[PDB]
């Protein structure tokens, strides 16, 4: 391979063997320098693919997917408020049908990108779809599968105390800070009709594990295939329907695809065309801190039965009389009476005209279209009008009821995306002597557009009905559109010498819409070398290859980042907004992000060198790459002192750097005609470092964070993703300071840097057995390093449910290194502490994070996982023969089967987020639904 940077090719068979709805999730831990995480285990969700770390401080770091080989739309659809209404609906590449994948090839370097443009800076996932035959006999391949999912990891709970606060008993608590379990009959919950439920005060450990069912999902695939000496035709249809382990149909994903791809050669001239249609309907059991389903589930005392709260003829479960009023509702109700739906119709495809002429030349024209409509319909009942008066939840809770002012809301949004891409190329390929010159010169044109229409309606008249006319109060209406365009010209020169020295030289030049008129043009060259020794007695070294490449790759800004705009006047206030018009007056404000027509194109320089060797007839094999990736002058909306009149300014950041080692090992310790055993060990170690952010705006900028709480940044001397949290004060050396009177730790002056987001190293191992027609595959995914915010740990600490909180058998205690600080004027003196945290105040010692305080809730990102297990029995051809089958392969598999995590983490599967599949998702998990354990069957029938 003349390629002089790292890359990896995966066969369609390995992609679809894992039988995932999705093309990338099965490659989760199997490819070095390609970090593949799923945002959650909700059906239909996004998937994250970052290669050689985050280069783009905000907020685009997926690789350019490229199907045939047309750029594919990879946009993502998730909630702009992960704190209160969190939901994730899809990734662009979730549409591609894994049974139509023939070869994936993940380009990783940013040095030879002229063919695939600027978006390649983040890697390219070159996909190439199946085609023609001939083959015995008629062309049909049928795949139909069936899988279940099961909850994988719930937080480790405690079963020593029950419902209560301050340590005392309580009938209505949303938490477990009560007396020790007696077994003694006690009351709980509200009083209805002068009666009340009375039950043994005993723990129930399974009471959450029991809430969940087993998600089910059925899959059906069909393909039709054939060919001649001048043509080929593939026609395919995939179908999926998923109903996850959360109860009800609230966790739904339906996927349908239909694709027709065909080629024909007469000439000289070849013409082919791919056309595809993709449907999906999602329903997301929303997460958040409000009346959502999970946050309502964790806030459950350890003695309360959750599967008993479902029946709604037991008046104690109807919204009015549910056992707790503390910002929480019956989960079964939230899933049954709320709406969060997403539907999508997509059309994308390509046309390609290849015409060979004059012995050595080839003309190729390629146009791609990818256009989408999607429609969200979220809504929630008028909880107030239906349940406030009368119920103790209710009038009885005054200003503080869960139903105020939950007066009902319904919105609807229709989103339209369209991008057309044009490639016009003329290749050249002649051999002279032992040399071989191939050159390629082309033109690329690209236009991308997105727009959406939104209407929302509040305070619903008929409480249940979700319709843009069931309201007496003014509707809210929003409308947006974006348009970018890019033209470019590129040449790629391939040198060669007798199949031994390959040299490549690419150069591209783009003119982008998103950069200031006066500075639209940026040029980036690239040089690649490849040296096979090997070609220089021993049948011991199958293959050897040494690689080097130095290249650049520019980028442009996001849209509309040059001119200052005036917006319609609105002000953000905590948990609200005060938006114009009022009253009868409309008004505009000066936009809070200063624009800049002094910008210059972004530039990524890479230096990469690698080595590849194979031994003993491809029975021991290893590939190693080292990379040094810089990314300078990235356009970013850098933070700024608001007193300047603006809240941020668009300017050119400094270098974001990723260096690291990408290494793959693979050997076949056994081989016969009847049994093979392969091993594989891949290892990735990356070093991420923000090198500088413009000095004059201070040093740092926020990437995501709570107001006065744990927030992740991008600081000048540090990695991408340095957290800060409230750490506890400590004296001149020791020495937790606590309050003289409560006993509780004492916040320090500043927050404290508490880790970055990055795994220190990631690696994966894999084994593959074959015995006659039997296959067995196992894969493990190892990541260690880094850290993430976890509201899962946060709410199980606040609630007193998490195992860690039975710390001192919940007897009064003195923080074991505590010290009071004695300040008089400016005299500072430290004294052994003598004040305990009392029983009544144990709840607060944990509620705020223990002696760690806030920072307690940055969880050790690290995990080890049993990624997948795939057993496959290829029936032997003699078996069938009296049947119309050309092949049968029964298959049984499991995914995300088991997670291991380091002691301090007994809360989550770290592979979670409530903030999307890119950079900001690294901030953490905001009570995302639990991850799940998937397993099932799949039958293949070739005709």
């Amino acid at each position: 391979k003349a390629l002089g940077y790292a890359a990896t090719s995966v066969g369609g068979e390995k992609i679809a063997e894992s039988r995932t709805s999705d093309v990338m999730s099965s490659l989760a831990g199997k490819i070095a320098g390609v970090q593949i995480s799923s945002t959650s285990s909700d059906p239909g969700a996004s998937n994250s693919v970052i290669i050689r770390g985050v280069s783009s401080l905000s907020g685009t770091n997926q690789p350019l997917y490229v199907v045939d080989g047309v750029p594919l739309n990879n946009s993502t659809v998730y909630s702009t408020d992960g704190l209160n209404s969190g939901y994730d609906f899809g990734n662009g590449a979730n549409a591609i049908n894994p049974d139509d994948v023939a070869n994936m090839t993940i380009l990783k370097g940013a040095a030879a990108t002229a063919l695939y443009g600027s978006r390649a800076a983040n890697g390219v996932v070159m996909i190439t779809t199946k085609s023609g035959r001939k083959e015995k006999g008629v062309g049909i391949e049928y795949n139909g599968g069936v899988q279940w999912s099961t909850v994988l990891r719930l937080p480790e709970f405690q079963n020593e105390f029950g419902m209560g606060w301050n340590g005392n008993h309580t009938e209505l608590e949303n938490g477990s800070w009560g007396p020790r379990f007696d077994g003694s009959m006690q009351l709980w919950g509200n009083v209805y009709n002068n009666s009340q439920k009375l039950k043994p005060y005993v723990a129930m450990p399974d009471n959450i594990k029991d809430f969940f069912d087993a998600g089910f999902r059925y899959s059906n695939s069909l393909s039709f295939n054939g060919a001649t000496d001048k043509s080929d035709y593939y026609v395919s249809f995939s179908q999926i329907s998923d109903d996850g382990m959360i109860p009800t149909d609230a966790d739904s994903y339906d996927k349908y695809t239909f694709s027709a791809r065909g080629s024909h050669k007469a000439g000289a001239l070849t013409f082919s065309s791919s056309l595809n249609y993709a449907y999906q309907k999602n329903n997301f059991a929303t997460t958040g801190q409000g009346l959502s389903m999970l946050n309502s589930l964790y806030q459950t005392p350890r003695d309360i039965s959750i599967i008993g709260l479902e029946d709604q003829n037991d008046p104690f479960n109807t919204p009015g009389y549910y056992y707790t009023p503390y910002g929480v509702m019956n989960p079964y109700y939230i899933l049954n009476n709320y709406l969060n739906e997403y539907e999508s119709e997509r059309f994308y495809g390509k046309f390609q005209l290849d015409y060979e002429f004059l012995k050595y030349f080839k003309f190729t024209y390629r146009m791609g279209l990818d256009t989408t409509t999607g429609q969200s319909d979220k809504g929630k009942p008028n909880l107030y009008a239906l349940y406030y008066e009368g119920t103790p939840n209710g009038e009885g809770q005054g200003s503080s009821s869960p139903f105020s002012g939950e007066t009902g809301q319904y919105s609807e949004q229709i989103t339209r995306r369209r991008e057309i891409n044009q490639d016009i190329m003329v290749n050249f390929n002649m051999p002279v002597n032992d040399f071989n010159i191939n050159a390629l010169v082309g033109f690329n044109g690209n236009e991308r557009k997105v727009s959406y229409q939104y209407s929302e309606v509040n305070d619903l008249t008929i409480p249940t009905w979700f319709n843009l006319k069931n309201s007496g109060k003014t509707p809210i209406v929003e409308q947006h559109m974006e348009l970018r365009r890019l033209m470019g010209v590129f040449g790629q020169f391939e040198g060669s010498w007798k199949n031994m020295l390959y040299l490549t030289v690419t150069a591209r030049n783009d003119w982008s819409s998103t950069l200031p008129k006066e500075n639209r043009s940026f040029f980036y060259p690239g040089i690649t070398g490849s040296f096979i020794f090997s070609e220089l007695l021993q049948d011991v070294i199958t293959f050897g290859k040494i690689r080097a490449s130095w290249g650049k790759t520019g980028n442009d800004a996001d849209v509309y980042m040059v001119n200052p705009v005036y917006a319609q006047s609105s002000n953000r206030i905590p948990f609200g907004s005060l938006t114009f018009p009022l009253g009868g007056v409309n008004a505009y404000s000066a936009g809070n992000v200063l624009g800049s027509n002094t910008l210059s194109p972004e530039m990524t320089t890479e230096s990469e060198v690698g080595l590849n060797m194979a031994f003993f007839k491809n029975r021991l094999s290893f590939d190693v790459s080292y990379y040094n990736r810089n990314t300078d002058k990235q356009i970013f909306s850098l933070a700024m002192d608001p007193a300047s009149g603006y809240t941020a300014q668009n300017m050119n950041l400094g270098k974001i750097r990723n260096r690291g080692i990408e290494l793959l090992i693979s050997g076949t310790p056994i081989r016969t005609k009847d049994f093979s055993w392969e091993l594989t060990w891949n290892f990735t170690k990356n070093w991420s470092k923000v090198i500088s952010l413009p000095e004059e705006l201070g040093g740092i900028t926020t990437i995501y964070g709570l107001n006065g709480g744990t927030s992740m940044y991008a600081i000048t001397g540090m990695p991408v993703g340095v957290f800060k949290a409230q750490v506890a004060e400590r004296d001149p050396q020791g020495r937790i300071v606590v309050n003289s009177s409560t006993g509780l730790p004492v916040e320090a002056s500043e927050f404290g840097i508490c880790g970055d987001m990055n795994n220190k190293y990631q690696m994966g191992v894999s084994t593959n057995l074959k015995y006659k027609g039997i296959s067995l595959g196992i894969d493990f995914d190892i990541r260690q390093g880094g850290v993430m915010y976890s509201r899962t740990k946060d709410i199980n600490y606040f609630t007193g449910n998490a195992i860690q909180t039975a710390y001192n058998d919940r007897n009064p205690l003195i923080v074991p290194n505590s010290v009071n600080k004695i300040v008089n004027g400016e005299n500072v003196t430290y004294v052994e502490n003598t004040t305990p945290i009392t029983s009544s105040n144990i709840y607060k010692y944990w509620g705020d994070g223990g002696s760690d305080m806030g920072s307690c809730f940055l969880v050790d990102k690290s995990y080890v996982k049993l990624r997948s297990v795939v057993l496959g029995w290829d029936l032997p051809k003699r078996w069938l023969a009296k049947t119309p089958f050309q092949a049968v392969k029964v298959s049984a598999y499991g995914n995300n089967l088991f997670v291991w995590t380091p002691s301090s983490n007994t809360f989550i599967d770290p592979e979670m987020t409530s903030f999307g599949n890119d950079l900001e998702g690294n901030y953490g998990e905001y009570t995302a639904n639990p991850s799940s354990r998937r397993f099932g069957f799949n039958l293949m029938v070739k005709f």
């Binding site: 704190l83 949303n174 801190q289 806030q299 707790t324 009023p325 926020t702 964070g705 609630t799």
Partner: peptide, 10 residues
Amino acid sequence: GGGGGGGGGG
């Protein structure tokens, strides 16, 4: 510029 959580009841 940030985002507010809320505490709970108890």
